[PDB]
Each structure stands twice: as structure tokens, then as C-alpha cells.
Design a protein around this ligand. Structure first.
Ligand SMILES: CC(C)(C)CNC(=O)Nc1ccc(NC(=O)c2cccc3cn[nH]c23)cc1
Ligand SMILES: [Fe+3]
Ligand SMILES: [Fe+3]
Length: 296
């Protein structure tokens, strides 16, 4: 209900729709009269929901030509095996390390296990992960998606070691995945998601702050941010991460164990993701983040 946060399914801009669940959304870009792209790859159990929404906008799904992926986490690529078979002309665009994850039997195994925990139903017939129609893309690569859509790949490691963002400079629009963290709907601030490397996470935010002023900021969860939330997004995310480090140091300096802020963080932050993230995994991830901050 905040005017700066668009969090409803359907049309978001002249060229853009939100498909599926706002908390794990798939974004639809209209590239031309007969060309479309998807951005973010969701959770597996949403295959039929997202497919249903897609077909309400796109009369012929063979016109879906690209599918852009920020990182390899199970909640950002779980749909790929289940929907790519229904998209004969789609090319999945992911970073090198993200593509490597789909060639790893053990990595794919974790992804499938996490996604099956979210099943209420049984999944569509899936192609193999290693058989996905992928094309690796590089840091700085320009994605000429259509006559009015040129997006630059920008490496944004720290949340995960493969993470990238996509920047539409015509629209000052950044698809930032989880590199800024989890947007707090009740409080209007970023919650950090430092799950791989704090130093890389903070350096990505420094670089993203140097982009031309954002008009639209589109993370991996929660919808589209605009106004000052977009303009100040990368900076605020940086600030909130330092705020979490200071908090961690304060408590450790009082002899607290990492388990204590972990439980408080899980209590205070675990509610937002309970529909796509098992509660033990949220607590575990909070523990892992504090471990990462504590070292670095
Ligand atoms: C990468 C592989 C080896 C291939 C295994 N694959 C995975 O996907 N592991 C995995 C990924 C993400 C999460 N997430 C979170 O804990 C979390 C917590 C709060 C908000 C948000 C918003 N997004 N995520 C979160 C947990 C485990
Ligand atoms: Fe993630
Ligand atoms: Fe995520």
C-alpha cells in the first residue's frame, strides 16, 4: 500500500509485468510486437501459476526469446527445467558460474531438494538441468534484447559467488536480484543477505551506487521500488549492512554467541520468506551470514 513499492501481479510499466507471486516473482518484458523476455527464475512449484500468468499476456509463447537469471540459488532458477520445455525459442542468459552450477550434479541436487520442500501437487515434466538452452554472459556484456531494450550485465558478487545484476540504462532500471538484500516491507529498509562474502557484497554495492541515478529498482523478491527507494537503494543497502556488522560486534563484545543474534534475526526477519523458504533454512542462513560478517 506504499506508493513507492509496486507489489501486485500484472502490469507494472508500459513494457513490464509481474508474473506469479510477488514474493518470488518472474518479470515479463515486452521487447516488440512478437518478442518477450523473462527476468528471474523463481521456485519450481510456481511453474503452473507463472505459466498461467504468462499465457494471459503472451498469446504465442514461442515469442519468449530470452530468460535472464541473476544467480543460482534455488529460489531464482527453480522454474527453468519446468517451463523452458514450453518455451521452444527461449535462451537462458546467466553468468559463467551460474551456468556451471547447472552442470554440477551436486549443486542441482540441492536446488531440487529445496524446491521440492515447497510443493503443496506434482511438477510438469522437466528437461535436464544440463540440457537447458543456456548462453553464458560476461561481466560488462551488453544484452541487445530488442530495439528498445539494451541491458548491461554487471557482476555483483557477495550475496553469492555467481551473482549478477542487469541494468536497463534507457529506463534507469536495475534488476538487482538479492545483491541489496531483502527489502523490509513493514519498515522500508534493506535487510542484508550476505551469504557468501561480505567484502565482495559491499564492493558490489559501491559500484552499483555509481550507476546513473535509478528510477526503478527490482530485487529478487517483493516487487518494484521507485522514487527515492530506487535512487538511494544501493547506498541504503550498504548502510544497513554496516549497521548489521556494528550490531554483531556490539553483542559479541558482550560475550554473546552467534546463535543469539541468529535467533533474534530469524524471529524478527523470518516471517517475510516463510512461503518460499523453510524456517530452518532461514535461521541457518542468518547463522551463516553472521559467521561471514564475524570473520570479515
Ligand atoms: C547454491 C547451491 C549449492 C546450488 C544450493 N542452492 C541454494 O539455493 N541454497 C540456498 C539459497 C538461498 C537461500 N535463501 C535464504 O536463506 C534467504 C533468507 C531471507 C531472504 C531471502 C531471499 N532470498 N533468499 C533468502 C537459502 C539456501
Ligand atoms: Fe539468493
Ligand atoms: Fe532469493
Amino acid at each position: 500500500s506504499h506508493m513507492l513499492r509496486l507489489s501486485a501481479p500484472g502490469q507494472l510499466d508500459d513494457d513490464l509485468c509481474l508474473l506469479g507471486d510477488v514474493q518470488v516473482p518472474v518479470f515479463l518484458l515486452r521487447l516488440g510486437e512478437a518478442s518477450w523476455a523473462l527476468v528471474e527464475g523463481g521456485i519450481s512449484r510456481d511453474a503452473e501459476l507463472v505459466w498461467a500468468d504468462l499465457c494471459r499476456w503472451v498469446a504465442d509463447p514461442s515469442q519468449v526469446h530470452y530468460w535472464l537469471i541473476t544467480h543460482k540459488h534455488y529460489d531464482h532458477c527453480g522454474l527453468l527445467p519446468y517451463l523452458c520445455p514450453r518455451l521452444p525459442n527461449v535462451q537462458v542468459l546467466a553468468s559463467e558460474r551460474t551456468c556451471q552450477a547447472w552442470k554440477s550434479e551436486s549443486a542441482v541436487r540441492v536446488v531440487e531438494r529445496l524446491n521440492r520442500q515447497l510443493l503443496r501437487q506434482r511438477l510438469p515434466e522437466a528437461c535436464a538441468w544440463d540440457a537447458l538452452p543456456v548462453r553464458a554472459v560476461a561481466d560488462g556484456e551488453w544484452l541487445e534484447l530488442g530495439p528498445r531494450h539494451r541491458l548491461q550485465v554487471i557482476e555483483a558478487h557477495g550475496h553469492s559467488d555467481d551473482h549478477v545484476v542487469f541494468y536497463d540504462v534507457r529506463r534507469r532500471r536495475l534488476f538487482c536480484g538479492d545483491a541489496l538484500g531483502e527489502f523490509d516491507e513493514a519498515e522500508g529498509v534493506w535487510r542484508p543477505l550476505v551469504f557468501d562474502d561480505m567484502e565482495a557484497y559491499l564492493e558490489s554495492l559501491e559500484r552499483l551506487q555509481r550507476l546513473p541515478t535509478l528510477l526503478q529498482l527490482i530485487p529478487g523478491h517483493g516487487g518494484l521500488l521507485r522514487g527515492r527507494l530506487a535512487a538511494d537503494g544501493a547506498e541504503s543497502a550498504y548502510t544497513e549492512c554496516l549497521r548489521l556488522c556494528r550490531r554483531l560486534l556490539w553483542r559479541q563484545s558482550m560475550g554473546e554467541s552467534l546463535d543469539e543474534l541468529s535467533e533474534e534475526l530469524h524471529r524478527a526477519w523470518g516471517g517475510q520468506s516463510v512461503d518460499f523458504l523453510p524456517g530452518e533454512l532461514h535461521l541457518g542462513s542468518m547463522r551463516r551470514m553472521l559467521e561471514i560478517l564475524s570473520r570479515q
